[PDB]
């Protein structure tokens, strides 16, 4: 969730 292309959440 650090990368611009991310799509998988986090927290």
């Amino acid at each position, epitope marked *: *969730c650090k990368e*611009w*292309l*991310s*799509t998988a*959440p*986090c*927290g």
Partner: antibody
């Protein structure tokens, strides 16, 4: 229906500051990433800022030309998107669009825009 | 910064005809893993906000009619409009999402009457 209404544009003097606002409606604001795109007088579009959802710890991205000057933020509980602009320059003159942009897909809905003129 | 270049800068076709415009990326937009091309197409009608027409280079957006066909891969993409009608005059921009965002100069469509 999805409704993005921006307000707050106007005449501001160089090196001044202005804060835009966007009221979102018709969709779960808490889940989508929001963007600000602008269009200079008689020119093409230029993406300005982006703020991902809480599930992505509110990650913010800024175009090179707007970095360290503008500040995108949001209020999930009020469904408001903000763009605090500082050290304004003439280059920042144009219409500012409020865009709902799902991370992974594309820029879904755009607002009607709000004009901003930077001049003395 | 990825630079997208579009051509022609303007086009003029008659109603009922089909038109094809191009967009070329300075960097390759094809993602190795998903095999998806991060390129979208938008259009802006006179005095209106931009509207999404296509994303991932070929998937039409919701509600967008089948007249709009997006194609290409890598660094070269195309938007094809069939049955070009009066209501289609606008400026068409291709945008990239591979890294940050970047739109192209746009291509203007005019109706030959």
């Amino acid at each position: 229906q999805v409704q993005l209404q921006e307000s707050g544009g106007g005449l501001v003097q160089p090196r001044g500051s202005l804060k835009l606002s966007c009221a979102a409606s018709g969709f779960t604001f808490n889940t989508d990433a929001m963007n600000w795109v602008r269009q200079a007088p008689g020119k093409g579009l230029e993406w300005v800022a982006r703020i991902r959802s809480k599930g992505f710890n509110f990650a913010t991205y800024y175009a090179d030309s707007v970095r360290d000057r503008f500040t995108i933020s949001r209020d999930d509980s009020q469904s408001m998107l903000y763009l605090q602009m500082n050290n304004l320059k003439t280059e920042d003159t144009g219409i500012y669009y409020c865009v709902r942009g799902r991370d992974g897909e594309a820029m879904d809905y755009w607002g009607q825009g709000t004009t901003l003129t930077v001049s003395s | 910064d990825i630079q997208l270049t579009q051509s022609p800068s303007s086009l003029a076709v008659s109603a009922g005809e089909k038109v094809t415009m191009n967009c070329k990326s300075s960097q390759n937009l094809l993602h190795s893993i998903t095999r998806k091309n991060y390129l979208a197409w938008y259009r802006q009608k006179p005095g209106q906000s931009p509207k999404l027409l296509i994303y991932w280079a070929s998937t039409r957006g919701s509600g967008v009619p089948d007249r709009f066909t997006g194609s290409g891969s890598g660094t070269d993409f195309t938007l094809t409009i069939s049955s070009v009608q009066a209501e289609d005059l606008a400026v068409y921009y291709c945008k990239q999402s591979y890294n940050l965002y970047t739109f192209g100069g746009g291509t203007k469509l005019e109706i030959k009457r």
